[PDB]
Tab-separated table of N, CA and C and ligand atoms in Angstrom:
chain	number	residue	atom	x	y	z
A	1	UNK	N	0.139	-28.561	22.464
A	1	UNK	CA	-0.494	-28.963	21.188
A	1	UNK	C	0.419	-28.672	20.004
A	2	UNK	N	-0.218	-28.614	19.082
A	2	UNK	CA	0.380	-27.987	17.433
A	2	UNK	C	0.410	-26.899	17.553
A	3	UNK	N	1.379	-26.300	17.414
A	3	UNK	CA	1.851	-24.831	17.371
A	3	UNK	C	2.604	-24.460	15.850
A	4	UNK	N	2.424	-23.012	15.166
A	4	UNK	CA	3.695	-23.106	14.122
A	4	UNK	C	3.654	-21.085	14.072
A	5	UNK	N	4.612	-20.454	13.781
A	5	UNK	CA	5.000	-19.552	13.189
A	5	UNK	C	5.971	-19.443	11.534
A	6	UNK	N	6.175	-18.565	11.112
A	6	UNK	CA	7.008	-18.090	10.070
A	6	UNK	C	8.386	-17.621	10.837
B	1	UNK	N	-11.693	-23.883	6.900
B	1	UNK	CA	-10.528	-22.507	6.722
B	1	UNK	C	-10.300	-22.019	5.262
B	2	UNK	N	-10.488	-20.712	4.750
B	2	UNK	CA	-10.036	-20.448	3.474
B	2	UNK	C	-8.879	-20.177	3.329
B	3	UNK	N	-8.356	-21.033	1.384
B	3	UNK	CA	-7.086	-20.768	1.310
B	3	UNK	C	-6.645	-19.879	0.211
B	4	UNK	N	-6.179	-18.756	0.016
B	4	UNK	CA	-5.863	-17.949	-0.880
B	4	UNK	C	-4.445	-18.920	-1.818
B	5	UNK	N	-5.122	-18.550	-2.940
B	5	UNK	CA	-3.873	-18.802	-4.183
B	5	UNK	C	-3.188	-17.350	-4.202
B	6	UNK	N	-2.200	-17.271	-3.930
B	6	UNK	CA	-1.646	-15.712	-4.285
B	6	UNK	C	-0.571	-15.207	-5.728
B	7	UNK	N	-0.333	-14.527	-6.407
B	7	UNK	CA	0.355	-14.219	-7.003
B	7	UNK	C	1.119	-15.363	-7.729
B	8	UNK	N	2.227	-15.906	-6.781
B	8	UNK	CA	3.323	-17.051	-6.694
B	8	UNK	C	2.097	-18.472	-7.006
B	9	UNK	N	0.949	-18.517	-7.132
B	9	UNK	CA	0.423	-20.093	-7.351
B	9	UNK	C	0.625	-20.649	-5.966
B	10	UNK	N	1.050	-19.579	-4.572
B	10	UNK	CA	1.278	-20.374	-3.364
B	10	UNK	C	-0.031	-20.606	-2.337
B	11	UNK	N	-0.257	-21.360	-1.740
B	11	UNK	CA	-1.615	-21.247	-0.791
B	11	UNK	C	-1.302	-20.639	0.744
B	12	UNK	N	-1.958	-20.237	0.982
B	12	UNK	CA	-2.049	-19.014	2.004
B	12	UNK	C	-3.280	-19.743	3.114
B	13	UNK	N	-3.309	-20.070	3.937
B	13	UNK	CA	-4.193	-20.857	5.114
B	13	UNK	C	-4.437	-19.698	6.027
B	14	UNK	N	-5.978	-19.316	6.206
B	14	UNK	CA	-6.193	-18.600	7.174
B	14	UNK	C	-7.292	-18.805	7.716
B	15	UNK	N	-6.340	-17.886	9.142
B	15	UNK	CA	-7.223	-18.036	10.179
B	15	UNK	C	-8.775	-18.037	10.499
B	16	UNK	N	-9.579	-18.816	10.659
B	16	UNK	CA	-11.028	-18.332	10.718
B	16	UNK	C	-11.796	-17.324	11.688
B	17	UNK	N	-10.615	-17.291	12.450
B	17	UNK	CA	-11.290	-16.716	13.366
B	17	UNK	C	-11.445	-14.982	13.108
B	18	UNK	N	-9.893	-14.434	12.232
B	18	UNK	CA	-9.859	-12.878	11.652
B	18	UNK	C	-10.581	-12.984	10.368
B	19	UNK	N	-10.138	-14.111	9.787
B	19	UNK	CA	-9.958	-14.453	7.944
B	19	UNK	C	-9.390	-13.392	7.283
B	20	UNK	N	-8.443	-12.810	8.481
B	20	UNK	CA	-7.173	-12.079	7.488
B	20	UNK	C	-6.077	-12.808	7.586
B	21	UNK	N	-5.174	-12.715	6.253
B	21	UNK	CA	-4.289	-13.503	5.717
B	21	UNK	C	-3.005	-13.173	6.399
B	22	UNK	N	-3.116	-11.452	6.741
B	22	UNK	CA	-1.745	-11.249	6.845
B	22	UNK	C	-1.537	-11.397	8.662
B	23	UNK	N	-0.825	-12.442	9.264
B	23	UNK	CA	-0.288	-13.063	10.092
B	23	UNK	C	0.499	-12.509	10.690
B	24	UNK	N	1.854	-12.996	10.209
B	24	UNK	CA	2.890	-13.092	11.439
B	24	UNK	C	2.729	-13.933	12.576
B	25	UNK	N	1.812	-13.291	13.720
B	25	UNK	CA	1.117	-13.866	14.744
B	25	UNK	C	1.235	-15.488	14.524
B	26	UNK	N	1.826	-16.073	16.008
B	26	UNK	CA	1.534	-17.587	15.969
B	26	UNK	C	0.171	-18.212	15.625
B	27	UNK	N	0.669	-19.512	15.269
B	27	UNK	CA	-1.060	-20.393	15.023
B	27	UNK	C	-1.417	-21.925	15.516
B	28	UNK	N	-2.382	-22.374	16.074
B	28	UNK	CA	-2.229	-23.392	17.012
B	28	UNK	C	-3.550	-24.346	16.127
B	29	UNK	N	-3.109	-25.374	15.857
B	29	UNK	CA	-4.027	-26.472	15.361
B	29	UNK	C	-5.390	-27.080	15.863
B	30	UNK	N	-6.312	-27.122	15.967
B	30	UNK	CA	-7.227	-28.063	16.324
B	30	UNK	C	-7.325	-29.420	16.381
B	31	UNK	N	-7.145	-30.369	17.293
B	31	UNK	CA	-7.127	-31.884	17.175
B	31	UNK	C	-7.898	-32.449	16.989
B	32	UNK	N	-9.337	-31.889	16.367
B	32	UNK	CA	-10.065	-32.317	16.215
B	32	UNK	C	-10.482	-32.092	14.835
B	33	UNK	N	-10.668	-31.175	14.014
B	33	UNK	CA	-11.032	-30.698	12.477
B	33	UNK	C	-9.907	-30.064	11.852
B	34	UNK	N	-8.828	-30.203	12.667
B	34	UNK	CA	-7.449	-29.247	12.356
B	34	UNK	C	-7.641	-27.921	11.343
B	35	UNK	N	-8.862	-27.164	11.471
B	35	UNK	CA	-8.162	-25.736	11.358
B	35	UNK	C	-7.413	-25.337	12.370
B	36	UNK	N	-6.624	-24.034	11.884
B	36	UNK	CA	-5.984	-23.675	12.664
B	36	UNK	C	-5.479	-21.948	12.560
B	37	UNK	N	-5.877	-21.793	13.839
B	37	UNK	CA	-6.081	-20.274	14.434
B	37	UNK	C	-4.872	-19.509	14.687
B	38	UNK	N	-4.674	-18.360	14.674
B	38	UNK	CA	-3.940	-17.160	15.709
B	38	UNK	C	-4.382	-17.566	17.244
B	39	UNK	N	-3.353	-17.442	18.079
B	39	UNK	CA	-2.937	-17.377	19.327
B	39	UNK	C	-4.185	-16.927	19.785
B	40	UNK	N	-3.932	-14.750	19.308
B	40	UNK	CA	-5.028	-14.027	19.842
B	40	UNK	C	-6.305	-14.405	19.312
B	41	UNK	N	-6.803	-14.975	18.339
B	41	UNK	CA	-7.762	-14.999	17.749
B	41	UNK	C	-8.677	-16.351	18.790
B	42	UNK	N	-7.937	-16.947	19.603
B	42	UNK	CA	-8.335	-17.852	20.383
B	42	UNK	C	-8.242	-17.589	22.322
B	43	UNK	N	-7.211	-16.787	22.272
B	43	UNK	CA	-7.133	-16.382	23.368
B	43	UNK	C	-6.412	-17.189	24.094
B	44	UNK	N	-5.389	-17.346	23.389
B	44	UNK	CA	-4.507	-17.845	23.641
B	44	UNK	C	-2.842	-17.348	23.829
B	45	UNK	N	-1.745	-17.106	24.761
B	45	UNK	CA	-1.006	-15.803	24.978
B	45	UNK	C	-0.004	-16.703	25.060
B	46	UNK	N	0.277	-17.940	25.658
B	46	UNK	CA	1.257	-18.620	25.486
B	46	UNK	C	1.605	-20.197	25.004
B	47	UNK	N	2.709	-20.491	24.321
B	47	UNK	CA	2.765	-21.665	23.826
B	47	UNK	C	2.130	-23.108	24.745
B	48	UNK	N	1.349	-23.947	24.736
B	48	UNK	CA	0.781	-24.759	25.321
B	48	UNK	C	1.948	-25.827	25.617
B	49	UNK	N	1.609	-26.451	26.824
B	49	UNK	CA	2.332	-27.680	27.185
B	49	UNK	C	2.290	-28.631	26.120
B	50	UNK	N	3.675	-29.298	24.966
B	50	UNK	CA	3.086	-30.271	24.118
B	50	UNK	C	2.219	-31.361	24.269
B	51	UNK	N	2.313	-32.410	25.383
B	51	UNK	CA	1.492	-33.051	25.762
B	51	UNK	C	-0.211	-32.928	25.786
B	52	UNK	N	-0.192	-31.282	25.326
B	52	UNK	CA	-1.901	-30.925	25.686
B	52	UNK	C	-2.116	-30.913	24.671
B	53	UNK	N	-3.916	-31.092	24.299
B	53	UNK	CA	-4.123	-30.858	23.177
B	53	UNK	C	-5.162	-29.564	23.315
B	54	UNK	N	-5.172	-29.472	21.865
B	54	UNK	CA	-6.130	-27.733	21.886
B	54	UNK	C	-7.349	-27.572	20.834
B	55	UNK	N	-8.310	-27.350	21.147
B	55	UNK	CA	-9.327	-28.046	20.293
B	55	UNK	C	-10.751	-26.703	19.533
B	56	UNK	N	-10.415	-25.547	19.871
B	56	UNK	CA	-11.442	-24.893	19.143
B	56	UNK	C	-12.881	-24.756	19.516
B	57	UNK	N	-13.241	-23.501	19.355
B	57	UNK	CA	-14.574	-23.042	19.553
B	57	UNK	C	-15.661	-23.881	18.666
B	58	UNK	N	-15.693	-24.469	17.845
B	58	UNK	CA	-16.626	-25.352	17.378
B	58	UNK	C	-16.232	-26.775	17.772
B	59	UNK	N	-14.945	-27.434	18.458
B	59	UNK	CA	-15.338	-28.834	18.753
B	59	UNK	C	-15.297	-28.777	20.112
C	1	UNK	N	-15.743	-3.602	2.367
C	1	UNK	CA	-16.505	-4.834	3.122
C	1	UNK	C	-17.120	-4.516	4.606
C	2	UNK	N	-18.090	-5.479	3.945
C	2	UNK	CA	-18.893	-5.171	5.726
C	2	UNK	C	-18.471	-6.288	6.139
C	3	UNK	N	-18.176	-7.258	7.939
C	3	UNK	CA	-17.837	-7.748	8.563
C	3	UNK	C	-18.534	-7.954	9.270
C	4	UNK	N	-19.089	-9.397	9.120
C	4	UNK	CA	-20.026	-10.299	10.515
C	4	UNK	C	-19.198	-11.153	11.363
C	5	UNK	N	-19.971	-10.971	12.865
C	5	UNK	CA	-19.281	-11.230	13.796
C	5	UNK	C	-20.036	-12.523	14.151
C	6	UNK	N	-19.551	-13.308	14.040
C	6	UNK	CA	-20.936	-14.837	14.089
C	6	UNK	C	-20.846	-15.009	15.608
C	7	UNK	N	-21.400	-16.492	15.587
C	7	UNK	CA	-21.978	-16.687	17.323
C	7	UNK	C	-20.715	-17.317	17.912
C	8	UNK	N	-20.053	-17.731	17.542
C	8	UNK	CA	-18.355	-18.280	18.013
C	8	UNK	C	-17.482	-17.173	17.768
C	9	UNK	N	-18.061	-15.847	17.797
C	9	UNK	CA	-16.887	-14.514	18.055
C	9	UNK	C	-15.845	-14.741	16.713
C	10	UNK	N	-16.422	-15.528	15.434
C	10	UNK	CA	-15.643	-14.997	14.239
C	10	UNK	C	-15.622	-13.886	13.048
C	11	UNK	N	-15.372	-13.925	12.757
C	11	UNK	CA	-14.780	-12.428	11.602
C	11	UNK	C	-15.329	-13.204	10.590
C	12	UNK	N	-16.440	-12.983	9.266
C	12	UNK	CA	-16.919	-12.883	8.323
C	12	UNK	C	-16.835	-11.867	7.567
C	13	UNK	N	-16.068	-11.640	5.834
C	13	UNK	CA	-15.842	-10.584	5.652
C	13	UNK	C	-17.003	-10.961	3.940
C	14	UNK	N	-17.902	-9.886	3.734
C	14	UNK	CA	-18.716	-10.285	2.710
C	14	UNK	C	-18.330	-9.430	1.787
C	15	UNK	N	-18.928	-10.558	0.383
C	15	UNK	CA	-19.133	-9.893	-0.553
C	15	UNK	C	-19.591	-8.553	-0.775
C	16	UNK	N	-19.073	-7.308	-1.235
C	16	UNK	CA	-20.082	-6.241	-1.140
C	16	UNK	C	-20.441	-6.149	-2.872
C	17	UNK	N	-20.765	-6.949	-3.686
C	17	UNK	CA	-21.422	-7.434	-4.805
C	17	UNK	C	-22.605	-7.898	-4.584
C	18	UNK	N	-22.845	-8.972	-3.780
C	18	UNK	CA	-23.799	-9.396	-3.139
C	18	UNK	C	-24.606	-9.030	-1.637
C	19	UNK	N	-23.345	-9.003	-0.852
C	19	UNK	CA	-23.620	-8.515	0.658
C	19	UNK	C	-24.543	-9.707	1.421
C	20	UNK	N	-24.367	-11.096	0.670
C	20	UNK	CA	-24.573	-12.013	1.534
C	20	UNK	C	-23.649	-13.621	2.216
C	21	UNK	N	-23.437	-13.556	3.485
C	21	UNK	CA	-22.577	-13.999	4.002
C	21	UNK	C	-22.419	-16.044	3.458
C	22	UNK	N	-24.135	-16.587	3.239
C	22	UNK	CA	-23.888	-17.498	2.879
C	22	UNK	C	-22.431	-17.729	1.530
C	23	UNK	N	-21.596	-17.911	1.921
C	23	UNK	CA	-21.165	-18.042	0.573
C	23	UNK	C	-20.476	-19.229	-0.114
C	24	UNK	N	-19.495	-20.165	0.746
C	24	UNK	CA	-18.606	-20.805	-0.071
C	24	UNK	C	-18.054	-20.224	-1.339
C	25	UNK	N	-18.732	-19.959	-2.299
C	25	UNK	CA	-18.368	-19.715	-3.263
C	25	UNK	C	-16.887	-19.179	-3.719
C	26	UNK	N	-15.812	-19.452	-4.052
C	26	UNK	CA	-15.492	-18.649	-4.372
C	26	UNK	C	-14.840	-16.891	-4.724
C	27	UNK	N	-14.068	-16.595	-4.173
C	27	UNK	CA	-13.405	-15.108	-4.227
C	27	UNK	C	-12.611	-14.881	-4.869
C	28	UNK	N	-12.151	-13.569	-5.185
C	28	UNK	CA	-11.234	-12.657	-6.064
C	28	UNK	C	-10.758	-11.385	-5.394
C	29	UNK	N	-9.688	-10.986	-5.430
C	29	UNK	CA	-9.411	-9.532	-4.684
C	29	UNK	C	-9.055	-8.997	-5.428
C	30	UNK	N	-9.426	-7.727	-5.009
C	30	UNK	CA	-9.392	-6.686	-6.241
C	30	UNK	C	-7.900	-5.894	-5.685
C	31	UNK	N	-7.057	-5.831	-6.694
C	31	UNK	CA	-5.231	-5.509	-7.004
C	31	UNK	C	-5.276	-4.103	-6.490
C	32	UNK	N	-5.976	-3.242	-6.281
C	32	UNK	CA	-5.807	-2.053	-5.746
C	32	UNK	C	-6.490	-1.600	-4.347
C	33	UNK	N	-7.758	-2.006	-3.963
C	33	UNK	CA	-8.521	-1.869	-2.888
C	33	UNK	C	-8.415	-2.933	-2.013
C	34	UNK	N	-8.035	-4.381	-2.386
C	34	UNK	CA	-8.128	-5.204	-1.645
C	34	UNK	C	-9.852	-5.875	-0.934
C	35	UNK	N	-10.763	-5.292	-1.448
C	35	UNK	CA	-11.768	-5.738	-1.191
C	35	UNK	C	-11.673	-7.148	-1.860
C	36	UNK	N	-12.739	-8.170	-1.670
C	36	UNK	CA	-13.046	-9.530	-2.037
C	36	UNK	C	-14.327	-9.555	-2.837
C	37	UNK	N	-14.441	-10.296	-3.736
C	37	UNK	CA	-15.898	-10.218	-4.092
C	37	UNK	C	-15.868	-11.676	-4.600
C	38	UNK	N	-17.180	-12.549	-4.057
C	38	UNK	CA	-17.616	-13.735	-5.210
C	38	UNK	C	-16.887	-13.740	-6.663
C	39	UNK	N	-16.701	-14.791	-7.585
C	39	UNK	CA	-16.586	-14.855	-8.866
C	39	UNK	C	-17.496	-14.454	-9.623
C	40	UNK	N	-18.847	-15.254	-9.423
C	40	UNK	CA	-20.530	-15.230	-9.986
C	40	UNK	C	-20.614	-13.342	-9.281
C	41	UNK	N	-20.501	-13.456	-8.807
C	41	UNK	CA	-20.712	-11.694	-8.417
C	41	UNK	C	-20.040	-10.355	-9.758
C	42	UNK	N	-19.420	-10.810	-10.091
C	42	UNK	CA	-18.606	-10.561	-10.493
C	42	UNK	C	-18.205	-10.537	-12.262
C	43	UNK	N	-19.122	-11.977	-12.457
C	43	UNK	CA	-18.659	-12.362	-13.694
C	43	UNK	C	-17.444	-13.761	-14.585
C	44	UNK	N	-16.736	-13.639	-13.415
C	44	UNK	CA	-15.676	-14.697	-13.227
C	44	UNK	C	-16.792	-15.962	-13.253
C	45	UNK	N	-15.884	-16.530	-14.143
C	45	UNK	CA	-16.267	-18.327	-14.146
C	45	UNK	C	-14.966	-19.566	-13.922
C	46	UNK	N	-14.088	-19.117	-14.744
C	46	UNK	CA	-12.944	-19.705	-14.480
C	46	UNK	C	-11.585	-19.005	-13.178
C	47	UNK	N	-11.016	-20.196	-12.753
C	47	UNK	CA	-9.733	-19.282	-12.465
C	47	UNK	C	-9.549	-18.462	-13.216
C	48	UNK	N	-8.727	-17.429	-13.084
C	48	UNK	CA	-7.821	-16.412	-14.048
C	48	UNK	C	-6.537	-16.747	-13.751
C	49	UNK	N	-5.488	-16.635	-14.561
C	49	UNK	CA	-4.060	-16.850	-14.672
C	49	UNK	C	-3.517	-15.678	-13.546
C	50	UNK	N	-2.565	-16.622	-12.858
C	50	UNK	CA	-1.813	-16.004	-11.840
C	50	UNK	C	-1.230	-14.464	-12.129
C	51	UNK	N	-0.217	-14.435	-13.423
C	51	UNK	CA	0.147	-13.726	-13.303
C	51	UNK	C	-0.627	-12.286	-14.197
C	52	UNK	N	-1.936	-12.211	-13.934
C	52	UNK	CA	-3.116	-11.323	-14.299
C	52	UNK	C	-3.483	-10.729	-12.928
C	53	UNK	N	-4.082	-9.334	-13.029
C	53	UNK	CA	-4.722	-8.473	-12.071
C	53	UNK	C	-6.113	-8.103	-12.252
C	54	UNK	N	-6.531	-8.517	-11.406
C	54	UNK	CA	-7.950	-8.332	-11.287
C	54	UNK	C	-8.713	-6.736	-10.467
C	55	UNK	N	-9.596	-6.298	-11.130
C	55	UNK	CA	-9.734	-4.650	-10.535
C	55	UNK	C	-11.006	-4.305	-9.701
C	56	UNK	N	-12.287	-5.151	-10.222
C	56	UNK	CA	-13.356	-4.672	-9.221
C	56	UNK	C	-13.910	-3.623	-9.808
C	57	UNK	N	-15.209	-3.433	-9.965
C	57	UNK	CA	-15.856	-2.575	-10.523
C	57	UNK	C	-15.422	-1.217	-9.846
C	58	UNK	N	-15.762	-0.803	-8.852
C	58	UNK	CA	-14.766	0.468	-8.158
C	58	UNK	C	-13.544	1.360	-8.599
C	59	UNK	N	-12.573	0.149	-8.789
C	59	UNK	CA	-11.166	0.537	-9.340
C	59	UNK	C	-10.822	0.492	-10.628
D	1	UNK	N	-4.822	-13.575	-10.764
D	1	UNK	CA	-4.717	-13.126	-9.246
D	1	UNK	C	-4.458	-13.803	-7.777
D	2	UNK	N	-5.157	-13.129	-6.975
D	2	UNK	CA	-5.383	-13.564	-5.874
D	2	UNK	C	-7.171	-14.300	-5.812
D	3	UNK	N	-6.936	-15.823	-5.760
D	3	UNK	CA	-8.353	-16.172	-5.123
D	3	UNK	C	-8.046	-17.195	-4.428
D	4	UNK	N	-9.345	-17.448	-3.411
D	4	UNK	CA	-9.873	-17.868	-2.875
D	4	UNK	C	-11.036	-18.611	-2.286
D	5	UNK	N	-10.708	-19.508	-1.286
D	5	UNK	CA	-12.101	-20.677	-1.121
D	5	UNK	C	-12.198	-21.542	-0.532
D	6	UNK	N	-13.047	-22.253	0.265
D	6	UNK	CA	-13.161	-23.385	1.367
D	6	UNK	C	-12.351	-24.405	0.689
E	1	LIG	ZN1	-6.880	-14.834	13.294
E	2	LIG	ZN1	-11.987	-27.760	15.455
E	3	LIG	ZN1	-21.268	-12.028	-3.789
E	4	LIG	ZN1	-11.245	-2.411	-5.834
């Protein structure tokens, strides 16, 4: 899927 | 999902599931209402196959 | 703040001005405690300018 | 400040 980190 | 204005005029997107701001922790979208959660906050431990989709305790 | 745990295992963090979870409304954090409170709780009607600190009856 | 909201 959509994944996100910094 | 609430979004904090902080200091900087910047918006801050958080998680619903803690509705704490301070992160780090990965965050995975909903394909359906696209909030979007912490990993742990879903129970979720590793990055998903892209092909999959991931959809949340309310859809 | 007190913290409700709703029926989808989320984190609700309330007003302790009010101490009721319906809210939308609106929040402010207070620059030293970090608690949250409503605006209308509070007094707030408008945004306040970014680079202003807000204190909370407490602090 | 800091605010916030749906
Ligand atoms: Zn979370
Ligand atoms: Zn959803
Ligand atoms: Zn309140
Ligand atoms: Zn305070």
């Amino acid at each position: 899927a959509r994944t996100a980190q910094t | 999902m609430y979004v904090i204005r902080d200091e900087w005029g910047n918006q801050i997107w958080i998680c619903p599931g803690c509705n704490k701001p301070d992160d780090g922790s990965p965050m995975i979208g909903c394909d359906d209402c696209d909030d979007w959660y912490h990993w742990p906050c879903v129970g979720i431990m590793t990055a998903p196959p892209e092909e999959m989709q991931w959809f949340c305790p309310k859809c």
